[PDB]
């Protein structure tokens, strides 16, 4: 029962939905900031969860605006009573002195079985549908929101602007894609900034482009850009747009859309995902995973029903691809490649990569920082006349 196809045509059928909207309450915001500030302090006896606070200056801002970036230790999201479970999280102060949340990412979410809420029996017991299955595009996260002075603010996970630590920051690369996107549709940055603040919202995109930072699936000049997969309200709890409205927003401001499947029964979700994982491909395309969005309650009884995510990552051929990338990277340096799984095909792939790497050295260094990764992978894939799925089950 894989006769669910991914679609990016929901947008205009989103006509009957209203996007969630709540205004920020400055007392509760300022209360969150003192909770994070106390977690950011390194000598206390109590308050057992740590945060790192990095302010950031918004270079493009006329008010001289600044934002603080809040980063938790990864394991703290598995503790109860965090002041917020937002992963990316930026606060600021309006030019009229009001404290605000500038950027609110998703709640930290986990893969199946990596926590006890992500066990299949638990998802079947505490969640409620319809389950939204969104394509997990493979890139780097970008946050976009609008400040009170009209500044359009572009963040990566945890950072914004230019840093003395990298050659071109993720957020700058993202901001440059956003500028091209808007001019192509005759809209400007301040209109997007004005819009996102009007919705009290952070836009959540995946930046996917091999010219910048190539991951495990390819994004050429054709595919490159920002894929929109979420809009969240800039408030302490997690309230997110249903995906049809995200697709409508993507269409109104030029983002690439994230594919969506809605499945009503959770047993159909589980049967679906495990069926796609036998090939790692869907509808002719290869896919690293789905993000499943749905509603969950703390304990299945009286009380909550908050928006909740879990990931389903497809386990092959992608582990093989990783091994081929790390083995190719190992063989450019003075280190023997490690072969852990897929021994027979991996030594065939290494056999061929060595022929092409000795032919021109200029391949051999574009692979340190990664050019040619998928190209080298797909070149042998059909040198041997194989889809990566078939190579992965040669064993
Ligand atoms: Mn990712």
- CA separation, residue 101 to residues 43, 146, 231 (Å): 26, 11, 14
Q: How far is the CA of 313 from the centre of ligand 1 (A)?
A: 10
Tokens, residue 49 = 């969860």
Asked if 65 and 149 count as a contact pair (C-beta separation under 8 A), the reply is yes
Instruction: Give the span between the Cα atoms of 317 and 20, in whole angstroms.
Output: 38
Asked if 198 and 190 count as a contact pair (C-beta separation under 8 A), the reply is no
What residues are designated binding site for Mn(2+)? 136, 206
Instruction: Give the span between the Cα atoms of 119 and 214, in whole angstroms.
Output: 31
Tokens, residue 390 = 């078939």
Instruction: Give the span between the Cα atoms of 262 and 247, in whole angstroms.
Output: 14
Per annotation, catalytic residue among 53, 136, 355, 387? 136
Task: Compute the 3-state secondary structure of the chain and give helix, strand, coil in percent, each to the nearest 5.
Answer: 35, 25, 40
Instruction: Give the span between the Cα atoms of 293 and 203, in whole angstroms.
Output: 16
Asked if 133 and 261 count as a contact pair (C-beta separation under 8 A), the reply is yes
Among all chains, which residue has been given the structure tokens 């869907």? 282
Residues 6+ apart with CB under 8 A from 272: 1, 2, 4, 133, 261, 263
Q: How far is the CA of 136 from the centre of ligand 1 (A)?
A: 7
Resolution stated for this PDB structure, in Å: 2.5
Backbone angles phi, psi at 372, to 5 degrees: 80, 5
* Domains of the chain as residue ranges with CATH: 11-114+138-257 (3.30.470.30), 129-137+260-314 (no CATH), 318-392 (no CATH)
Asked if 360 and 366 count as a contact pair (C-beta separation under 8 A), the reply is no
Cα–Cα–Cα angle for 199, 201, 202, nearest 5°? Answer: 150
Exposed, middle or buried: residue 395 (CB in 10 Å: 0-12, 13-18, 19+)?
A: exposed
Q: How far is the CA of 64 from the centre of ligand 1 (A)?
A: 33
3-state secondary structure 148-207: CCCCEEEEECCCECCCCCCCCCHHHHHHHHHHHHHHHCCCCHHHHHHHHHHCCEEEEEEE
- Collapsing DSSP to helix, strand or coil, 41 comes out as coil
Among all chains, which residue has been given the structure tokens 């603010």? 153
The string of DSSP codes covering 89-145 is EEEEE-TTS-EEEEEE-PBP--BTTSSSTTSHHHHHHHEEEEEEEEE---SEEEEEE
Q: What burial letters (b/e) apply to 138-165, b meaning 16+ CB within 10 Å?
A: bbbbbbbbbbbbebbbbbbebbbbeeee
Spatial CA neighbour of 9 closest among 236, 258, 200:
258
Asked if 238 and 257 count as a contact pair (C-beta separation under 8 A), the reply is no
- CA separation, residue 251 to residues 74, 75, 133, 281, 377 (Å): 34, 37, 19, 26, 33
> What's the length of the chain?
395
Instruction: Give the span between the Cα atoms of 133 and 291, in whole angstroms.
Output: 6
Instruction: Give the span between the Cα atoms of 21 and 18, in whole angstroms.
Output: 9
Tokens, residue 216 = 């495990």
Q: How far is the CA of 139 from the centre of ligand 1 (A)?
A: 5
Backbone angles phi, psi at 290, to 5 degrees: -120, 145
Distance, C-alpha 48 to centroid of its chain: 28
Instruction: Give the span between the Cα atoms of 49 and 35, in whole angstroms.
Output: 11
Exposed, middle or buried: residue 302 (CB in 10 Å: 0-12, 13-18, 19+)?
A: exposed
Asked if 377 and 322 count as a contact pair (C-beta separation under 8 A), the reply is no
Backbone angles phi, psi at 282, to 5 degrees: -150, 130
Query: Looking at residue 6, what DSSP letter applies?
Result: P
Backbone angles phi, psi at 198, to 5 degrees: -60, -35
The string of DSSP codes covering 198-236 is HTTEEEEEEEE-TTT---SS---TTT-EEEEEEEEESSS
Q: How far is the CA of 137 from the centre of ligand 1 (A)?
A: 7
Q: Is 136 a catalytic residue?
A: yes
- Collapsing DSSP to helix, strand or coil, 343 comes out as helix
Residues 6+ apart with CB under 8 A from 386: none
Spatial CA neighbour of 235 closest among 102, 88, 72:
102
Instruction: Give the span between the Cα atoms of 86 and 158, in whole angstroms.
Output: 11
- Collapsing DSSP to helix, strand or coil, 215 comes out as coil
Instruction: Give the span between the Cα atoms of 146 and 24, in whole angstroms.
Output: 14
């Amino acid at each position: 029962a894989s006769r669910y196809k991914a679609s990016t045509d929901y947008a205009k059928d989103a006509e009957g939905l209203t996007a969630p909207y709540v205004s920020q309450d400055p007392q509760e915001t300022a209360a969150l900031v003192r909770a994070l500030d106390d977690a950011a302090k390194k000598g206390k006896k109590s308050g057992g969860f740590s945060v790192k606070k990095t302010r950031y200056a918004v270079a493009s801002s006329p008010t001289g605006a600044e934002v603080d970036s809040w980063r938790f230790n990864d394991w703290d999201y598995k503790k109860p009573d965090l002041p917020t479970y937002a992963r990316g999280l930026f606060t600021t102060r309006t030019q009229h002195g009001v404290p605000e949340i500038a950027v609110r990412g998703y709640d930290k979410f986990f893969n199946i079985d990596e926590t006890r809420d992500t066990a299949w029996s638990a998802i079947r017991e505490r969640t409620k549908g319809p389950y939204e299955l969104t394509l997990k595009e493979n890139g780097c996260i970008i946050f976009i929101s609008g400040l009170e002075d009209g500044t359009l603010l572009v963040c990566s996970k945890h950072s914004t602007g230019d840093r003395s630590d990298v050659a071109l920051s993720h957020s700058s690369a993202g901001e440059k894609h956003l500028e091209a996107q808007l001019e192509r549709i005759g809209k400007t940055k301040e209109e997007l900034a004005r819009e996102l603040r009007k919705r009290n919202a952070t836009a959540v995109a995946e930046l996917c482009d091999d010219s910048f930072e190539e991951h495990i699936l390819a994004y050429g000049p054709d595919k490159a850009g920002l894929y929109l997969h979420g809009i969240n309200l800039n408030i302490p709890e997690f309230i997110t747009y249903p995906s049809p409205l995200v697709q409508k927003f993507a269409e109104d401001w030029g983002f690439r859309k994230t594919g969506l499947i809605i499945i009503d029964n959770i047993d159909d979700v589980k049967a679906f995902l495990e069926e796609v994982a036998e090939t790692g491909a869907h509808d002719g395309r290869d896919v690293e995973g789905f993000v499943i969005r749905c509603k969950k309650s703390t304990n299945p009884g009286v009380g909550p029903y908050h928006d909740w995510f879990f990931k389903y990552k497809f386990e092959e051929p992608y582990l093989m691809y990783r091994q081929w990338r790390e083995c190719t990277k190992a063989l450019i340096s003075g280190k023997q490649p490690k072969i852990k799984k897929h021994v027979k095909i991996t030594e065939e792939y290494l056999l061929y990569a060595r022929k092409r790497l000795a032919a021109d050295p200029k391949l051999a260094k574009l692979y340190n920082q990664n050019h040619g990764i998928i190209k080298l992978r797909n070149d042998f894939l059909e040198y041997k006349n194989m889809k990566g799925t078939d190579a992965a089950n040669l064993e």
